[PDB]
């Protein structure tokens, strides 16, 4: 039983499942083949499986949020009276119920999201994100007149998939380069992004370009909303926009002692002159967005502005 | 789900005469303002509970929820109405729920995701429901009394306080500290809508032994440099912590942020509404052009657009401290305060 | 006479020339082949010639600056009991002896700029700039130990050319995506950019990713220095960082009617925008002077940036 | 290009005894602080112009530049010295150019245009201009203190740090008519003794003076109307080289939206661009912040005592100078009308 390729095995099979939920499901798959001998070790095989899952995935913040929720659930139910097998029984049966519950989350997020978009407004988005689309698509189903700027998200280039999705819903879209984002702010009425995880202070962990949009937005005095499920809330506190675990070593220079081997008109469009995959791996994949740049967090629990509210939920979680 | 569907209006009348009468006075805006609306709503609800008979608890809840719904849509920007409704709804559920415990023989929202999927439901809960309602009406009458006492922690001698318009809560706050401490207050008139009210309050502040200065709204920025604290009243506090307040307050708040001057807000918790300000265009109300431009100016009014909004909006980030009857709290903690006073289901009425 | 063809001509003639200077040389070799001899004839001339020049190149700001300098030199010594011809030869004579200083201005800049880089510091630059390169290279020869982040500058892709230019001088380099510039600011000690033109209030007109760097620099409390020659000063006052003459229509939307999964670690270089889309994106942005620490010129380092205004004041009477 | 070349040591000693004695006292920190260095340098220059013999203006210029280069190197963070030099260097140059043609605009237009007895016994004239500097260096406190009736008003609260004869003269002048208050943050460890003495003198003038620790600066800042600071020097980018802890006042002021006013004579304005702060900030002895008799502590810990503090140009709101009140953006034009921008590097 390999939990890593099982946690993987939940992601390509279901396009609309979230990494923390997939991690939860992967842990359920573990407890079904558990055959634990005592309670002390119903917890450590749960421990061992959770840890080795975290080590086997490069960006592990999102799934760890799920792993957190899961072991805390188990611990809390076992503390009370501790029939570790009813617990097992419970999870395994209501396993797929957890998946549909998660789908219900995003749907409720969308219903809270679309009233934010009003008639004749313009929306900016960074890359592709389930939920961001869900909010936008839901707004379109109510026949609301609005247009959407989308950013190509180097390296993932998720922007193309996102704008295809949006005009597949017959909504007008215009793609914008990562370097040209700030210039478009005077035309933007609202910025809307998604999140891989939400840290304790209500900050956002998402793909590389998000924090850039957050600053441009605050500078242009444009509202900046994020879309995240409550199970993406993780108990961890980055002390900066740069304080997260790195999967592979990034931002390092070469050391050129020895020779070789060996102007742009600024109107020239040279798509061949993009960075190669090797030096792209030398760049960060993720990005931290401090809460003072976030107008509101659109969750299944409602729209959270407090940025002590995400902390409040994490508090109630761990006691 | 309003009350028209449940029953014909003709007998939301003979069964609920106070409701149809309140709806009328709410639309015509004869009963206006947070406090007046709150009291009248609670009173109407009392005779509703008094006369309604709903034998399983769900008939009560559905009744009050539906009746409260039409009261909300009568005048949607008087959020104090809906707040009273939400209080009474939680009053019933919790009380009944407590009653449920009585027969014998969540705690996280995140944790729930992994959660798992009445007897003698009762009427004649009226005694306790009417009790709690009468309580609420009383607790509304004590807002000024236990708010003004917190002035001794924020109002000190020889300080200069900037306020705008007229607020009975703010006025009480100032005068309570004024008995023992002599300070100064600059009152910005709330032209054109809170003009007379503020001019009247300013006179009483002077009579209370407070160095009172009356300024036009344009002068707000000019005097901000010598102001220690901004103390504002509010019409309502929305879900995100934003302020639905009276026009001109944005001038004060913006000028205060620029001069790094603290903004304090004195308000009862009954003005705290869970509704989220999705569109400010629906929140700001506009009164008559009459208050700004005279009607005998025929040529001007025919050739120009005259706009008189009497509500302003303050984003929650411009408020440093909320002075409430529950105590002093940051805008951040308003989140939990709503969770403790309202059931989450009643956010949309 | 196809002045435009000429103007482009220098540009390829000599990589180290600046767009303003190339416009000045343009007007000179028009002033050579210009039969003229009426001030009315004499001064009707270029104006249709720089006008024709201004209308002939789509983004025209930099050449407009070199233009603006030229005519003000013309009328100011045509005023003064001015005879035509003595300026006509003197301009055509010393045309070679113009792209002299222009080249000497850049070196003057580099000699002023390079001490801003001190031992063990990390520099961040956006795209390719001859002036920035000049400063960095001049510091390198003095055996100064430093490393440089270079932004992959879409659409121009100038990041590659600048990276290789600096690699040749044995300067440690590292390329960053336009979306990762903010994440790198904590490791950056100083940000250094060039500018195609400097507006009246001391603001910068440059490549489309410039202002974003200045924004990240301000937020990360890091110095932001601009590198531009004096003849890039142009009298025009953008009222916003969005207010510039647009070459092509820009940022316009689709019009769809019923018209009939990606991880973050994934690297899809084949998932970029096409050039049809890129031609809908801007080529340049504007950087407000409050984001510019100091403006390195051949006139010295201008920190006032009411001083760029002072120079344009002197230029015009 | 110093004077160690173009002249021997013994030649310097004999020809320019003042230069030798100034070099020694600049290195030994005998002559110290902007004013003392300004006056002494100007007097030493009067000797240089009196003694030196030349037939060409250029010989005079490079002779002065060489003496300047040497005096500067003696104590480089006393910018006052070089400024006096650069002042005289310009004084020489245009006394020359009007003598040049009694015998009869923009730098942007220089890109397009024309390419390509003078020096001796203008000495008598040069010496006069040097005396003109001496006179101006005396009127600094008077030309500045007068402006206090436009900024200092009754019942205002003012924050100051360390000691500044300029700021003191500024305050007390307004204080002999108007009644206000001054909070004096001592300049511990360096400006400590001096600030206490100034605080007493202020109170004796009836200015209601409060002496606070440096850690109290933020706490009282909320009630302060105005910050009035002195400075050691004003650098090329409009920045401020000032005494220790002054950024505490600056940062706290910006955080409380309190205006920062700087009182300084123009002579403290130096064209030296701060490419660095490390070379700018000098470090005094650790004795000032830690007693040497703490044997265990001083052998086990790095103990640092900066003499100066730097303040970025955009943290000053107003400069009160002998010429008048000017914004930081105008310092650019103040220099180009005072120094010659080739003597920036001496």
Q: Residues B80, B270: contact at Cβ < 8 Å? A: yes
Angstrom CA distances, D153 to A164, B60, C62, D324, stand at 66, 68, 51, 18
Q: State the best of A200, A293, A306 to mutate against chain B, taking most chain B CBs within 10 Å.
A: A306
Distance CA A183, CA C282 (A): 8
Residues of A in contact with C264 (CB under 8 A): 59, 156, 196, 206-208, 285-286
A242 min Cα distance to partner chain B (Å): 26
CB contact under 8 A, C101 and D111: yes
What are the tokens at A141? Answer: 């189903």
Query: What's the rounded Cα separation, in Å, for the pair C84 and C88?
Result: 6
Q: Backbone phi, then psi, for B95, in 5-degree steps?
A: -65, -45
Residue A80 belongs to domain with CATH number: 1.20.120.1070
Residues in chain C: 317
Which token pair is C210? 């410039």
Q: Are residues A117 and A94 in the same domain?
A: no
Buried b (16+ CB within 10 A) or exposed e, D271-281: bbbbbeeeebe
Evaluated on CA atoms B77, B83, B85, B90, the torsion sign reads positive
Q: Is the CB of C101 less than 8 angstroms away from the CB of D236?
A: no
- Rounded CA separation A4/A20 (Å): 13
C chain contacts of residue A264, beta-carbon cutoff 8 Å = 127-128, 156-158, 161
Q: What is the dihedral of CA A153, A155, A158, A161, to 10 degrees?
A: 120
Decide: C149 and C174 in contact? Cβ < 8 Å: yes
Contacts of residue B259 in chain D, CB cutoff 8 Å?
Answer: 257
Same domain, C187 and C76: no
The torsion region of residue A23 among left (phi > 0), alpha (psi -120 to 50) and beta comes to: alpha
Distance (Å) of CA D174 to CA C296, D153, D166:
42, 8, 13
Query: Strand A121-126 and strand A146-151: pairing?
Result: parallel
Side-chain-side CA neighbours of residue D49 (13 Å) = 26
Task: Kindly tell me the burial class for residue D222, based on how many C-beta atoms sit within 10 Å of its own C-beta (0-12, 13-18, 19 or more).
Answer: middle
Instruction: Tell me phi and psi for residue D144, to 5 degrees.
Output: -95, -45
Task: Tell whether C36 and C150 lie within a shared domain.
Answer: no
CA A263 to centroid of chain Cα atoms: 40
D330 contact C CB<8A: yes
Label each residue of chain B as H, E or C.
CCHHHHCCHHHCCCCCHHHHHHHHHHHCCCCCCHHHHHHHHHHHHHHHHHHCCCCCHHHHHHHHHHHHHHHHHHCCCCHHHHHHHHHHHHHHHHHHHHHHHHCCCCCCCCHHHHCCCCCCCCCCCHHHHHHHHHHHHHHHCCHHHHHHHHHHHCCCCCCEEEEECCCHHHHHHHHHHHCCCCCEEEEECECCCEHHHHHHHHHHHHHCCCEEEEECHHHHHHHHHHCCEEEECCCEECCCCCEEEECCHHHHHHHHHHCCCCEEEECCHHHECCCCCCCHHHHCCEECHHHCCCCCCHHHHHCCCCCEECEEEECHHHCCEEEECCEEECHHHHHHHHHHHCCHHHHCC
With contact defined as 3+ CB pairs under 8 Å, the chains touching C are A, D
Pair (C28, C167) in one structural domain = no
Whether residue C266 contacts residue A127, with contact meaning beta carbons closer than 8 Å, is answered with: no
End-to-end CA distance of chain B: 8
Domain boundary among A50, A78, A110: A110
D147 φ, ψ (degrees, to nearest 5): -70, 0
Q: Of C110, C143, C163, which closes a domain?
A: C110
Query: What residues of B are in contact with residue A115 (Cβ under 8 Å)?
Result: 276, 278-279
Give the β-pairing of D157-161 and D181-185: parallel
Q: Using alpha carbons only, give the angle D126, D132, D133 rounded to the nearest 5 degrees.
A: 100
- Positive or negative torsion for Cα B159, B164, B170, B174: positive
What is the number of domains present in chain C? 2
Q: Kindly state whether residues A66 and A146 are assigned to the same domain.
A: no
Solving technique for this entry?
A: X-ray
Which candidate from D223, D255, D257 shows the least CB-CB separation from B259? Answer: D257
Q: Verify cis geometry, omega within 30 degrees of 0, for the bond prior to A261.
A: yes
Enumerate the β-bridge partners of residue B215.
B188
Beta bridge partners of B194: B190
What is the Cα–Cα distance from C17 to B280, expressed in whole angstroms? 54
Cβ of B335 and A312 within 8 Å?
A: yes
Of A267, A127, A290, A181, which Cα lies nearest the Cα of C210?
A181
Structure tokens at D140: 């600094």
Do both A229 and A115 map to the same domain?
yes
The two tokens of residue A297 are 């967090």
Q: Would an 8 Å CB–CB cutoff place D105 in contact with chain C? A: yes
- The answer to whether the CB atoms of A155 and C58 lie below 8 A apart is no
Q: Are residues A258 and A170 in the same domain?
A: yes
By the 8 A CB rule, do C62 and C20 touch?
yes
Closest by alpha carbon to A20, among A235, A191, A193, A225? A235
A10 lies in the same domain as A130: no
C-alpha closest to that of B321 among B262, B264, B268: B264
* Contact predicate D64/D1, CB 8 Å: no
Q: What are phi and psi of B236, to 5 degrees?
A: -165, 150
Q: Which domain holds residue A52?
A: 3-110
Q: Are residues A208 and A186 in the same domain?
A: yes
Specify whether the CB–CB gap between B237 and B274 falls below 8 A.
no
Tokens linked to D173: 């002048």
- Select the residue from A11, A143, A179 to test the C interface by mutation, using most C Cβ atoms within 10 A: A179
Q: Do A115 and B335 touch (CB under 8 A)?
A: no
The Cα D298–Cα D291 span in angstroms is 8
The three-state secondary structure class of C126 is strand
Q: How many A/C residue pairs have CB atoms within 8 Å?
A: 247
Nearest to C284 by CA among C193, C200, C219, C218: C193
**Could you tell me the two tokens for A162?**
């996102």
Q: Could you tell me if D237 lies within 8 Å of chain C, comparing CB atoms? A: yes
Angstrom distance (rounded) from CA D163 to CA D186: 8
CA separation for the pair D31, C47 (Å, rounded): 62
Do C143 and C232 sit in the same domain of this protein? Answer: yes
Q: Please indicate whether, in this complex, the C-beta atoms of B109 and A233 are within 8 angstroms of each other.
A: no
Phi, psi (rounded to 5 degrees) for C80: 80, 25
Token pair 């061949």 is at which residue? A272
**DSSP designation for D119:** S
The backbone region for D257, taken as left when phi is positive above 0, alpha when psi lies in -120 to 50, beta otherwise, is left
Question: What gap in Å lies between CA C125 and CA C191, rounded to an integer?
Answer: 6
User: Any idea what the CATH number is for the domain that residue A236 is in?
Assistant: 3.40.50.10470
| Rounded Cα–Cα distance for residues A261 and A140 (Å) | 55
Nearest to C136, CA basis, from C161, C158, C118? C118
A76 in contact with B, Cβ within 8 Å: yes
Q: How far is A73 from chain B (nearest CA, A)?
A: 6
Beta-strand relationship, C300-302 and C294-297:
antiparallel
Strand partners, D157: D181
The runs of H, that is alpha helices, within C150-261 are: 158-168, 210-219
Contact between chain C and chain B (3 or more Cβ pairs less than 8 Å apart): no
B114 lies within 8 A of chain A by CB: yes
Assigned token pair, C163:
């990276």
Residue among C303, C306, C315, C316 with most chain D CBs within 10 A, to mutate: C303
With contacts defined as CB-CB under 8 Å, which chain C residues touch D115?
94, 97
**CA-nearest residue of chain C to A17?**
C261
- Domain match, C71 and C199 both: no
- Boundary of a domain, candidates C110, C139, C158: C110
Q: Are residues A11 and A88 in the same domain?
A: yes
Residue the block writes with tokens 């220790």: D244
Angle value at C-alpha D72, between D70 and D73, nearest 5 degrees:
65
């Amino acid at each position: 039983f390999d939990i890593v390729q099982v946690y993987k095995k939940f992601l390509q099979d279901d396009p609309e499942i979230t990494m923390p939920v997939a991690a939860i499901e992967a842990l359920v798959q573990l407890l079904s083949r558990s055959q634990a001998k005592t309670i002390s070790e119903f917890m450590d095989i749960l421990q061992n499986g959770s840890n080795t899952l975290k080590e086997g995935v490069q960006n592990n913040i999102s799934l760890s949020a799920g792993c957190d929720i899961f072991q805390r659930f188990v611990t809390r139910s076992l503390h009370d009276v501790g029939d570790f097998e009813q617990c097992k029984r419970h999870l395994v049966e209501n396993g797929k119920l957890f998946i549909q519950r998660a789908r219900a989350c995003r749907q409720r997020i969308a219903h809270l999201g679309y009233p934010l978009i009003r008639d004749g407004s313009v929306i900016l988005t960074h890359g592709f994100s389930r939920g961001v689309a869900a909010v936008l698509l839901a707004a379109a189903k109510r026949h609301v007149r609005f247009k959407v700027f989308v950013t190509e998200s180097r390296p993932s280039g998720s922007g193309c998939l996102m704008t295809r999705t949006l005009k597949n819903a017959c909504i007008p879209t215009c793609m914008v380069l990562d370097s040209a984002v700030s210039f478009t702010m005077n035309r933007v009425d609202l910025v809307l992004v998604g999140a891989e995880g939400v840290v304790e202070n209500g900050g956002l962990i998402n793909q590389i370009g998000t924090f850039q949009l957050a600053v441009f937005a605050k500078h242009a005095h444009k509202p900046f909303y994020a879309v995240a499920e409550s199970h993406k809330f993780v108990r961890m506190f980055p002390l900066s926009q740069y304080d997260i675990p790195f999967s592979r070593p990034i931002l390092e220079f070469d050391d050129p002692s020895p020779e070789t081997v060996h102007p742009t008109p600024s109107d020239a469009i040279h798509n061949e002159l993009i960075m190669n995959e090797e030096q792209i791996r030398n760049n960060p994949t993720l990005d931290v967005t401090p809460p003072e740049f976030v107008s509101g967090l659109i969750t299944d629990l409602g729209i959270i502005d407090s940025k002590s509210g995400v902390s409040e939920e994490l508090i109630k979680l761990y006691l | 789900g309003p009350i028209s569907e449940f029953m014909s209006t003709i007998n939301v009348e003979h069964t609920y005469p106070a409701v149809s009468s309140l709806i009328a006075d709410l639309k015509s805006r004869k009963v206006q303002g947070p406090f007046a609306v709150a009291v009248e709503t609670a009173l109407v609800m009392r005779q509703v509970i008094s006369q309604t008979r709903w034998s399983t608890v769900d008939q009560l809840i559905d009744t009050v929820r539906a009746v409260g719904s039409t009261l909300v849509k009568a005048q949607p920007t008087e959020f104090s109405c809906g707040n009273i409704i939400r209080r009474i709804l939680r009053l019933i559920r919790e009380e009944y729920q407590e009653l449920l415990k009585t027969a014998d023989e969540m705690y996280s929202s995140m944790l729930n995701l992994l959660g798992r999927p009445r007897v003698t439901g009762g009427m004649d809960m009226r005694a306790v429901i009417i009790s709690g309602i009468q309580d609420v009406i009383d607790e509304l009458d004590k807002i000024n009394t236990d708010i003004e006492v917190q002035s001794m922690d924020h109002l000190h001698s020889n300080e200069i306080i900037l306020t705008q318009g007229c607020s009975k809560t703010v006025e009480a706050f100032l005068r309570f500290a004024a008995k023992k401490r002599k300070f100064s207050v600059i009152v910005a008139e709330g032209f054109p809508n809170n003009q007379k009210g503020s001019h009247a309050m300013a006179k009483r502040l002077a009579q209370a032994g407070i160095d009172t200065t009356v300024i036009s709204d344009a002068t707000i920025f000019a005097i901000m440099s010598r102001v220690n604290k901004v103390i504002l009243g509010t019409h309502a506090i929305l879900g995100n912590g934003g302020l639905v307040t009276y026009s001109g307050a944005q001038l004060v708040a913006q000028a205060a942020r620029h001069h790094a001057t603290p903004v304090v807000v004195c308000s009862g918790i009954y003005k705290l509404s869970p509704v989220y300000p999705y569109d400010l265009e629906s929140i700001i109300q506009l009164s008559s052009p009459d208050k700004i431009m005279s009607f005998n100016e025929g040529d001007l009014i025919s050739r120009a657009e005259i706009l008189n909004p009497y509500y302003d909006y303050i984003p929650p980030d411009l408020v440093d401290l909320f002075i409430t009857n529950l105590g002093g709290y940051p805008p951040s903690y308003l989140y939990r305060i709503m969770n403790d006073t309202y059931d989450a289901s009643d956010t949309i009425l």
